[PDB]
Amino acid sequence: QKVRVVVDNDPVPTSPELWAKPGHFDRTLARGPKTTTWIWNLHANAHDFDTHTSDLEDISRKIFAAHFGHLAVIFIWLSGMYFHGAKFSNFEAWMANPTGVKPSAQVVWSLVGQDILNADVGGGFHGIQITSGLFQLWRAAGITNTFQLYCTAIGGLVMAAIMLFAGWFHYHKRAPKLEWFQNWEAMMNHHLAGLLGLGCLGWAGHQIHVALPVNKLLDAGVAIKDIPLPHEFILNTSLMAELYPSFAKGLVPFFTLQWGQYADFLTFKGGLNPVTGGLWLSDTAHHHLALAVLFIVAGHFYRTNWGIGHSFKEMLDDAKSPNMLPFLNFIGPVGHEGLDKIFETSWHANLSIHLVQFGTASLLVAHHMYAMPPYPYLATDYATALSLFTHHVWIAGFCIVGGAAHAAIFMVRDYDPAHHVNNILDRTLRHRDVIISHLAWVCQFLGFHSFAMYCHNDTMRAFGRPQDMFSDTGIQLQPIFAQWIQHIHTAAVGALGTTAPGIGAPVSYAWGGGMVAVGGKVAMMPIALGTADFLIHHIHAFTIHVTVLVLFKGVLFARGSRLVPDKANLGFRFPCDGPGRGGTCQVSAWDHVFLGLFWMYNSLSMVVFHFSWKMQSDVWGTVDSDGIVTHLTGGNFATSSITNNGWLRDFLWAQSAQVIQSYNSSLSAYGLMFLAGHFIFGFSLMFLFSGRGYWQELIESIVWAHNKLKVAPAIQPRALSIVHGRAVGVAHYLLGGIVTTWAFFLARMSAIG
Amino acid sequence: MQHVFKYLTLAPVMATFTMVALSVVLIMLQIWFPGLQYGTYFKPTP
Amino acid sequence: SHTVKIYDTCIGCTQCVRACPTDVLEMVPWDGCKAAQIASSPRTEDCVGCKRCETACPTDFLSIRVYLGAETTRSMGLAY
Amino acid sequence: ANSTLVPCSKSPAFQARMKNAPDTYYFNKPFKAYAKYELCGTDGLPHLPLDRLDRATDVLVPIGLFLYVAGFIGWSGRSYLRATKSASDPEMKEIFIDLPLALQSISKAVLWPLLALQEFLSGDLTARDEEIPISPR
Amino acid sequence: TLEGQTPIFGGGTGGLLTKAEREEKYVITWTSPKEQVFEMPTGGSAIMRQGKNKLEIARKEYGIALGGQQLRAKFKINDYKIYRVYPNGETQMIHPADGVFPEKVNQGRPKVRYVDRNIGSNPSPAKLKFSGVQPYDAP
Amino acid sequence: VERGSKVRILRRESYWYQDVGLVASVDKSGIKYPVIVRFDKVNYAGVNTNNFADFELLEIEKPKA
Numbered sequence A: 001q002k003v004r005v006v007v008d009n010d011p012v013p014t015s016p017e018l019w020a021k022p023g024h025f026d027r028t029l030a031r032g033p034k035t036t037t038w039i040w041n042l043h044a045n046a047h048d049f050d051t052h053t054s055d056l057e058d059i060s061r062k063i064f065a066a067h068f069g070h071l072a073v074i075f076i077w078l079s080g081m082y083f084h085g086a087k088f089s090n091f092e093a094w095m096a097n098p099t100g101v102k103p104s105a106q107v108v109w110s111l112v113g114q115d116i117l118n119a120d121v122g123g124g125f126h127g128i129q130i131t132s133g134l135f136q137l138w139r140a141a142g143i144t145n146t147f148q149l150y151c152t153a154i155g156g157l158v159m160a161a162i163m164l165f166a167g168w169f170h171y172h173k174r175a176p177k178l179e180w181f182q183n184w185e186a187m188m189n190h191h192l193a194g195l196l197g198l199g200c201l202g203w204a205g206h207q208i209h210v211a212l213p214v215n216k217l218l219d220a221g222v223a224i225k226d227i228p229l230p231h232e233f234i235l236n237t238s239l240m241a242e243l244y245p246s247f248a249k250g251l252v253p254f255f256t257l258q259w260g261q262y263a264d265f266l267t268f269k270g271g272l273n274p275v276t277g278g279l280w281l282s283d284t285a286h287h288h289l290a291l292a293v294l295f296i297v298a299g300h301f302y303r304t305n306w307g308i309g310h311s312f313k314e315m316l317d318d319a320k321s322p323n324m325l326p327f328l329n330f331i332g333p334v335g336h337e338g339l340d341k342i343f344e345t346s347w348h349a350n351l352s353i354h355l356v357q358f359g360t361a362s363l364l365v366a367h368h369m370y371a372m373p374p375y376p377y378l379a380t381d382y383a384t385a386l387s388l389f390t391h392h393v394w395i396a397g398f399c400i401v402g403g404a405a406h407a408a409i410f411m412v413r414d415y416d417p418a419h420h421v422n423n424i425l426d427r428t429l430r431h432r433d434v435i436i437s438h439l440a441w442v443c444q445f446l447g448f449h450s451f452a453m454y455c456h457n458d459t460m461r462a463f464g465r466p467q468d469m470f471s472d473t474g475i476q477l478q479p480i481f482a483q484w485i486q487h488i489h490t491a492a493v494g495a496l497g498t499t500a501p502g503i504g505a506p507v508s509y510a511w512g513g514g515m516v517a518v519g520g521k522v523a524m525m526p527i528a529l530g531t532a533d534f535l536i537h538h539i540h541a542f543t544i545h546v547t548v549l550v551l552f553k554g555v556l557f558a559r560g561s562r563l564v565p566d567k568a569n570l571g572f573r574f575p576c577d578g579p580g581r582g583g584t585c586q587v588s589a590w591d592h593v594f595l596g597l598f599w600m601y602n603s604l605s606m607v608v609f610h611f612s613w614k615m616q617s618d619v620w621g622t623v624d625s626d627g628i629v630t631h632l633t634g635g636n637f638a639t640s641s642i643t644n645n646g647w648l649r650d651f652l653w654a655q656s657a658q659v660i661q662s663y664n665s666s667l668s669a670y671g672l673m674f675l676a677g678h679f680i681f682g683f684s685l686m687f688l689f690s691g692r693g694y695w696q697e698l699i700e701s702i703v704w705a706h707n708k709l710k711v712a713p714a715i716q717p718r719a720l721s722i723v724h725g726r727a728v729g730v731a732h733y734l735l736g737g738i739v740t741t742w743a744f745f746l747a748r749m750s751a752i753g
Numbered sequence B: 001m002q003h004v005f006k007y008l009t010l011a012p013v014m015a016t017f018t019m020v021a022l023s024v025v026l027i028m029l030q031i032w033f034p035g036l037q038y039g040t041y042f043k044p045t046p
Numbered sequence C: 001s002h003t004v005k006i007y008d009t010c011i012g013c014t015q016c017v018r019a020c021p022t023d024v025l026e027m028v029p030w031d032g033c034k035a036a037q038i039a040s041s042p043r044t045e046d047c048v049g050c051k052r053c054e055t056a057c058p059t060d061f062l063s064i065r066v067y068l069g070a071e072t073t074r075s076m077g078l079a080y
Numbered sequence D: 001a002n003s004t005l006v007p008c009s010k011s012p013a014f015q016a017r018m019k020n021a022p023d024t025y026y027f028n029k030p031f032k033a034y035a036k037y038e039l040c041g042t043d044g045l046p047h048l049p050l051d052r053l054d055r056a057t058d059v060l061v062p063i064g065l066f067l068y069v070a071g072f073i074g075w076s077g078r079s080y081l082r083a084t085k086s087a088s089d090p091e092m093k094e095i096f097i098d099l100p101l102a103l104q105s106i107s108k109a110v111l112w113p114l115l116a117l118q119e120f121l122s123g124d125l126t127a128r129d130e131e132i133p134i135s136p137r
Numbered sequence E: 001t002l003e004g005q006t007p008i009f010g011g012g013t014g015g016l017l018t019k020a021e022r023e024e025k026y027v028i029t030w031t032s033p034k035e036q037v038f039e040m041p042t043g044g045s046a047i048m049r050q051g052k053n054k055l056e057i058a059r060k061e062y063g064i065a066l067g068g069q070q071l072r073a074k075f076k077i078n079d080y081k082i083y084r085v086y087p088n089g090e091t092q093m094i095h096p097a098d099g100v101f102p103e104k105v106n107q108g109r110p111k112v113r114y115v116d117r118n119i120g121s122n123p124s125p126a127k128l129k130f131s132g133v134q135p136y137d138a139p
Numbered sequence F: 001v002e003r004g005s006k007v008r009i010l011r012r013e014s015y016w017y018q019d020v021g022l023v024a025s026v027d028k029s030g031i032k033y034p035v036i037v038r039f040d041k042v043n044y045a046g047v048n049t050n051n052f053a054d055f056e057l058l059e060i061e062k063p064k065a
């Protein structure tokens, strides 16, 4: 009875009248423009729904409707990739010869000589070599011809229209009440069992009935035309019996708990398929089936309407002293009580948590997809392997920064001191000086003992004293704990003794157990860790800890500090509180996000640089008939990556040869974008280094010239606000730097990968 | 519908229409007459 | 300490006094404006120089100005 | 007379580029035009000199063509802005283009070189110095 | 001595430092109609008690922010006072200076640092070279 | 000047120096700046109204009717 559906009918009329009233959502903006600052403020506050109205119910309805709009955008984008892979690609040719054809799904027109970008990708096709891994995804799903991709493109467009109609329907026709959105237990149950659980079950069905038989024939050498269509494996049961004898016995073993007879298509092998280099599809079918059961079971954890289940409020209210562990009772006698008020009213707090966990998920996607390549012919497609890791590392970094940003927004806007009296949130704010001072110290310790040790190495090498360097041949720093884990995980499968007997091959060959080669190229081999890996990992620890320091200082001091005690009244996003108190520039929580974006970029650039160099140096390469591996950079990492002169020379200077010499070739676009990224980075520096007072005064003289010729505009030109200038600077800085690395990575790996 | 027409006269909408139309004119000029250069405009093809 | 001066263009709107975070300003009787009051700065020793008073001043140009001078412990906003 | 610049059809480095050029739309016709009309340096690439009494139309035609188009855009904007100054809400006519007014301004801007001369002669082109906002000296 | 009972507070890191015991300190006292929760100037939440309260603060801005933005704006408490306490024990009441809030005009208040001209009439610095007077201080 | 008069500002430090405003009201008391002038263009603070003395204004157009 408590959980129920309740809505309003036609709460907002569907009229285009407000389309002709820009800034209608904001009281100040609704009056109209007087200066050019009005235009920027219109776009800056467009999606800040909690400033359009104070009604939480109306805000929540805007969130729900807008999410349908974003889903429609994703569906249009997904439809584009399937359509371009069905109409302007060499997918069919690539399926015939996966190891000798480069994927390509973008073809340019011939008007200004840009047709030179139509690279010779093989298969009698000319186009841009794609690095998104779409072909490897589609092959693993059993797709073999362009007609199936065309049908999926149509389905994506239809789904986009359905999503768009749902957003209009659930905002303009039937908008749920606020209490509908506050059903934590019902939402958690439905999204666990019904979204994650049923989606895993449905995909397990597709893998078992379609992907597994098609890929089994493909790996056996059967031609595309001789492989029956996916529905034939469902109708003709005898076909599935030949590939997997267990299908001849139907569903009887499943219902009798005799699941061991299904071991022929629900395998638990581990390792990689020797033919393709990807994970065994039968392994992933059992993985997703096990996930479906686990998620569906998790979906019956919360109490909705029948008494059975756990309650969020009771669980949070019980997590306090003295009900905690004896050494965990320091959280105080209030503990987690009162945190349920946060999730009742604060959308920003939930967005903060969810953006963090999308960063966690995307980081796990990046790390777990190269070491355990899940798609056929993905590991040996070096250009795709580097692109997939780099892309999902960058997505995670932005998501993490966004999580910190909206955590600070919650503190300024949604935090209520009355709800948090001696609870854990209140106690955390009350020893923020303890937390920040300790974090500042460990950042200094990490910086000295990670980066300054590289400077020690550079000076020793320049002095001609290699014996005094931190290296494998000098003063060694062996990562013994990481080396021990590699040995433990290798011995677990049989390759602290055999703790996972059921897995045949090593879970990942990066930990040891052997090498896999597919088309004369390494798919995965053990990744040895030495002094160079010890130094680079502690570089990551240093950069991450500093990025945490910038963001977490902003969140903990969003309400105020010893300098400006009333920052909460000033808001989340303000430029300063004047030149007084010595100068209070960039005290707002927004400016800590602005500074944290730079440190996230610095941290993640070294992460993808570490991956790119190490994989090229110690993993990727070609294998001859004798089993001898020659790597892409020939083992440079161990001796060259221990100094930043080696990074400058053997990584940046040496590996940029492809992008720097790409003119008059199919890779010339990457050369142009390489310069384009450099330009935007330098361009951003004037927004960051200067101030609007200079530019406003300069605009005064320019306005005078227009006034002299009676051509001055009524909308008075203004320099960008202080916050706006910072936002422009960081946006162009990150765009320029990331695009430069994007061109640098893709140009090199499309020529030598 | 009168509100839709008023929306179509917005500065971003008109600027996008003007930039797209100007881009189309220049693009089609490259297709019809590629390689035009200073000292070559309005000269017959040899 | 900083120096805060009030010029005769003041209209006695009391906005600068309300905006001051350290109670430097106060309204005093006057006859130069319709409001019959003018801003005064008797406690400039407590002025931090935030220029919140200047932001709140509606006159053009400003009727109240802050000239940053010698820095003290309290003018630097130091709790230590 | 400049001797280091010779016609592209006679510069030996130019045919080296022409024969080695790809056989596409982008190189067949343009190379033929460059050979006949352009002057090439020792590098075999066309160069644009401004020291020849002849081929002065090759300089004046692109210059005059741009100056007319740029003046057309400027005069259209200036006339439109001056027409909206008499409105009650001129700012709203800058984010909402008044189509009848814009078309009127564009049509008159075709003869902008004549209109600009007339306004300059009548003193309507520029505003007087004491009627323009300025900062203290 | 200043009389009053301190609000319920479990402690924090935003309190007083060596400056309080060495140079100067501030105390804000007020009276509330009931026991209720307010936000400390330097972070955290405290509970003001039923009777008259007394809070020790490191800076004067803390008292102005607490009394003005919280006690008056939110809790409708108007009798708060701010004192400056010196290490020797000398205590002086500084806010409100004369028992009337500064934003309300009060008789007997003299004009301080008033310039009898508009800002645009300040003399150029070249006229006052080596004289030691600033243009805004010029007669 | 009087209400409805069109004036030109002569105050050097004013944002509307040598610009044009419209007189909204004139105060008959002995205050320093009795004339209130409204402007179409806002200054850098977003304000479009200021008080001026008579000697700081130059009348340009008489009030209508």
Ligand code: CLA
Pocket (backbone or CB within 6 Å): A012, A013, A014, A015, A016, A017, A018, A019, A025, A061, A062, A063, A065, A066, A068, A069, A070, A072, A073, A076, A164, A165, A166, A167, A168, A171
């Ligand atoms: C069928 C057409 C239609 C019409 C006439 C309206 C009309 C209105 N909507 Mg509405 N809406 C629609 C469809 C429509 N909506 C759909 C399909 C959704 C789901 C996403 C919504 C979600 C929605 C929300 C959440 C809100 C409104 C609001 C409003 C009102 C303010 C006008 C406005 O948004 O100015 C803006 C005018 C524009 C022209 C902006 C368009 C720019 C778009 C949105 C950006 C592109 C993203 C796009 C959705 C992606 C999918 C398109 C795809 C083809 C790529 C107005 C009555 C607001 C309101 O009630 O006012 C306070 C409000 O908060 N609508």
Ligand code: CLA
Pocket (backbone or CB within 6 Å): A063, A064, A067, A068, A071, A180, A181, A183, A186, A187, A190, A191, A193, A194, A195
């Ligand atoms: C089992 C039931 C179920 C399922 C599957 C979902 C699924 C979803 N909910 Mg949801 N929800 C549910 C119950 C469910 N909800 C209940 C009971 C409540 C009330 C407590 C809510 C309240 C709620 C809110 C408030 C919000 C969501 C949102 C979302 C979306 C999250 C974005 C995402 O992961 O994209 C997944 C991407 C997909 C393409 C998934 C498919 C999407 C369609 C609509 C699923 C249709 C499944 C249906 C059975 C048809 C299947 C046919 C055939 C295959 C069998 C997702 C589509 C968020 C959102 O984005 O809103 C739009 C959001 O803000 N939900």
Ligand code: CLA
Pocket (backbone or CB within 6 Å): A043, A044, A045, A046, A047, A048, A049, A351, A355, A398, A399, A400, A401, A402, A403, A405, A409, A572, A573, A590, A593, A731, A735
């Ligand atoms: C689920 C994701 C998500 C959602 C729903 C929101 C939602 C919101 N964020 Mg948020 N944010 C996110 C992720 C998200 N954010 C991430 C990942 C970051 C880290 C970068 C931030 C950082 C952030 C800041 C710093 C701020 C917000 C703010 C806001 C609020 C106002 C939105 C706004 O200003 O419109 C966006 C309007 C724009 C004009 C932005 C578009 C311009 C972008 C930067 C261009 C990007 C370049 C392009 C991708 C590549 C080049 C293009 C090419 C043409 C060159 C709104 C509640 C603001 C606020 O006030 O919150 C209360 C605010 O100050 N967010």
Ligand code: CLA
Pocket (backbone or CB within 6 Å): A140, A141, A195, A196, A197, A198, A199, A200, A203, A279, A281, A284, A287, A288, A291, A357, A358, A360, A361, A364, A365, A368, A369, A374, A375
């Ligand atoms: C533990 C979760 C998990 C894992 C490890 C995998 C693993 C895999 N999936 Mg899969 N999948 C999952 C969940 C998962 N899936 C769910 C929930 C759905 C939808 C219901 C799907 C739908 C799906 C499809 C449709 C397809 C795959 C495919 C694949 C394979 C390609 C690699 C990949 O997706 O990246 C691996 C991903 C990860 C390592 C991490 C992402 C997993 C989630 C996001 C982690 C969330 C944890 C989070 C950070 C913590 C939450 C907070 C905490 C308090 C709980 C691989 C075997 C493809 C295939 O064909 O395989 C060959 C394919 O086409 N998956």
Ligand code: CLA
Pocket (backbone or CB within 6 Å): A440, A441, A443, A444, A445, A446, A447, A448, A451, A452, A455, A546, A549, A550, A595, A598, A599
């Ligand atoms: C290469 C340039 C550079 C360097 C060296 C630093 C250094 C530092 N930044 Mg920093 N920063 C930079 C660029 C740089 N930044 C840029 C471009 C930005 C803009 C985004 C920032 C933004 C930024 C923020 C927002 C923060 C820092 C922080 C820090 C400190 C981190 C603690 C640490 O590593 O201590 C160890 C010190 C070093 C590693 C510096 C190098 C020392 C050399 C190698 C050894 C010197 C030997 C000896 C002492 C020399 C003495 C001889 C004598 C004659 C002088 C440190 C002082 C954080 C901080 O203060 O945390 C406590 C912090 O919060 N910075």
Ligand code: CLA
Pocket (backbone or CB within 6 Å): A701, A702, A703, A705, A706, A709, A711, D073, D074, D075, D076, D077, D078, D080, D081, D097, D102, D103, D105, D106
């Ligand atoms: C109405 C159009 C118009 C006209 C006639 C002028 C005229 C002038 N501008 Mg100017 N300007 C304009 C728009 C215009 N501007 C816009 C929109 C901007 C913002 C980007 C600027 C920014 C600008 C700067 C920063 C400077 C000038 C300068 C100048 C002077 C000499 C250089 C020159 O021609 O500018 C060259 C042109 C530009 C720098 C950019 C203008 C290009 C825009 C995009 C064209 C817009 C056309 C418009 C939309 C047409 C709509 C009409 C339609 C409704 C009918 C001259 C008085 C310079 C000066 O003071 O000289 C002494 C100077 O330093 N302008």
Ligand SMILES: CC1=C(/C=C/C(C)=C/C=C/C(C)=C/C=C/C=C(C)/C=C/C=C(C)/C=C/C2=C(C)CCCC2(C)C)C(C)(C)CCC1
Pocket (backbone or CB within 6 Å): A074, A078, A194, A195, A198, A199, A200, A202, A203
């Ligand atoms: C991450 C991400 C992504 C995505 C991905 C994917 C691909 C996902 C998927 C997902 C999924 C894949 C989901 C699914 C879901 C499902 C569901 C939700 C289902 C349901 C079902 C049901 C409900 C059923 C029912 C029935 C019937 C019908 C009849 C009989 C009875 C029964 C009950 C059985 C992208 C890249 C785009 C972007 C970025 C991010």
Ligand SMILES: CC1=C(/C=C/C(C)=C/C=C/C(C)=C\C=C\C=C(C)\C=C\C=C(C)\C=C\C2=C(C)CCCC2(C)C)C(C)(C)CCC1
Pocket (backbone or CB within 6 Å): A709, A711, D050, D059, D070, D071, D072, D073, D074, D075, D078, D112, D116
């Ligand atoms: C022979 C020749 C040459 C040279 C030239 C020269 C040396 C020139 C000079 C020139 C000059 C020395 C000029 C001056 C001027 C001045 C002024 C003062 C101007 C003004 C202008 C205006 C005023 C304009 C206006 C307008 C128009 C008309 C249109 C549009 C709009 C506007 C408004 C902008 C060269 C080699 C390059 C090239 C070849 C040929």
Ligand SMILES: CC1=C(C/C=C(\C)CCC[C@H](C)CCC[C@H](C)CCCC(C)C)C(=O)c2ccccc2C1=O
Pocket (backbone or CB within 6 Å): A686, A687, A688, A690, A691, A692, A695, A696, A718, A719, A720, A721, A722, A724, A725, A726
């Ligand atoms: C340059 C700069 C400016 C000046 C920049 C301004 C006023 C923004 C100008 C934006 C323009 C008008 C947008 C349009 C630019 C496009 C390139 C125009 C395209 C034209 C087509 C015909 C191609 C600031 O205002 C500023 C403020 C604070 C800190 C730093 C800075 C800063 O660095």
